Design a protein around this ligand. Structure first.
Ligand SMILES: [Mg+2]
Ligand SMILES: [Mg+2]
Ligand SMILES: [Mg+2]
Ligand SMILES: [Mg+2]
Ligand SMILES: [Mg+2]
Ligand SMILES: [Mg+2]
Ligand SMILES: [Mg+2]
Ligand SMILES: [Mg+2]
Lengths: 219, 219
RNA sequence: CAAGGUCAUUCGCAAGAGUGGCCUUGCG
RNA sequence: CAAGGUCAUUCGCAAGAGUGGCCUUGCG
């Protein structure tokens, strides 16, 4: 029907269109035929394609660089960017749900498992379809790759270097409805203390940690 | 030669023998050409091989069952078992190191990345070599697969069901040299408390939890 | 899968690195 | 990547399921 329109974006024609439909169906829309298992298989397939390239083109091939980068190139956030070219929102089948960024990420992966199977489990061919559509995007993403350490990690590495000690984080208070909480955390190392807040302990512990870092860059 | 002996086991001959040597060389033996990067790629390749089988033959296809099982089928523990057939201890190059279960695990992974590459990056052929050698073992392990939940998980799931509360663990004491520490932990829920000891907090907390389950289910 | 500190041990003139144990952080 | 509890919400007679938020556990 309109599937033929997605097959054109992919540049591949299924023999079993029921297969392609499964990749596009959420659990809410059909309890029997949905993408959950194909997403399982898709994860592997795609992780493998990404890793294949990463290893060939990465500028820095250190474990500490490669892992953080691979984690991003394989993340939901990154698959939503690649999935734009395919306009999945108009093909996905869902009942009373809202096609969020989680869904898209899952159908994206499931879609690749779907083409693999349909192509008689041909891994090279599928790896080719994928590169034909995303290599450029991935190669550039890699070219400008950057490990972005989070505050907690940073702070912890400063205090261990300087004093060989780790900061402490203690919960000061919690407020709001259970589905809408606000946490106030305290970060402390030595006699330096700072607070932080956010929708979760970690988010709050993070904010508190950024402030302690600056509180130390100054003292 | 002797690497020709390994090629006979794998059932594949390299065009670039030095690549094969790379997969077998640990960092201490050579700072320039060793297996770290290949193991990175091999990790993905194999993950993909196991997943493909898991989804076709697994008796149960629920995510809660497939994740644990996939966890096992790609673990060091399992690669050492599959690697026995290859006798890697006699091909691996190590300088003053001890060919541990971790080294073998990485060379196993690195060996398959090396086949892939030398194969002109043919993922089908490589997936077939892998199966010709391990499908039976894998199919067997899958056939007898079973999620084996740990004590901390079991316990936490008992307290949440009955009281909707989680147990708390607290460090009671630490003994020994830093490279040899003995921990004693306390588990508690309500007015029930038990101790546990081990080489780490975690191991200590587990024993503590196992006994708490026993204390509860009994009392 | 990565990151930091630490103990033991091996290599090294040093820098640094390898192996094993522990604490902790991040991501999935 | 999985597991459990909970809050909000949607579907439901109920059982239970989907979506979002939080606490925690395990593995890598
Ligand atoms: Mg999944
Ligand atoms: Mg994923
Ligand atoms: Mg996913
Ligand atoms: Mg690696
Ligand atoms: Mg591995
Ligand atoms: Mg490994
Ligand atoms: Mg590792
Ligand atoms: Mg998931």
């Amino acid at each position: 029907k309109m599937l033929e329109q997605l097959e054109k974006k992919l540049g591949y024609t299924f023999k079993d269109k029921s297969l392609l439909e499964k990749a596009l169906t959420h659990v809410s829309y059909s309890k029997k035929e949905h993408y959950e298992t194909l997403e399982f298989l898709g994860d592997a397939l795609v992780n493998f394609f990404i890793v294949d390239l990463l290893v060939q083109y990465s500028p820095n091939k250190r474990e500490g660089f490669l892992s953080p980068l691979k984690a991003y190139l394989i993340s939901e956030e990154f698959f939503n960017l690649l999935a734009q070219k395919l306009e999945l929102h108009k093909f996905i089948r869902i009942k009373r749900g809202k096609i969020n960024e989680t869904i898209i990420g899952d159908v994206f992966e499931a879609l690749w498992a779907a083409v693999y199977i349909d192509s008689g489990r041909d891994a090279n061919f599928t790896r080719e379809l994928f590169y034909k559509l995303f290599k450029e995007d991935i190669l550039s993403a890699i070219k400008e790759g950057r490990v972005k350490k989070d505050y907690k990690t940073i702070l912890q590495e400063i205090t261990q270097k300087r004093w060989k000690e780790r900061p402490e984080y203690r919960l000061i208070s919690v407020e709001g409805p259970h589905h809408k909480k606000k946490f106030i955390v305290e970060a402390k190392i030595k006699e330096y203390r700072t607070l932080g807040e956010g929708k979760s302990k970690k988010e709050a512990e993070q904010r508190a940690a950024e402030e302690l870092i600056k509180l130390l860059e100054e003292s």
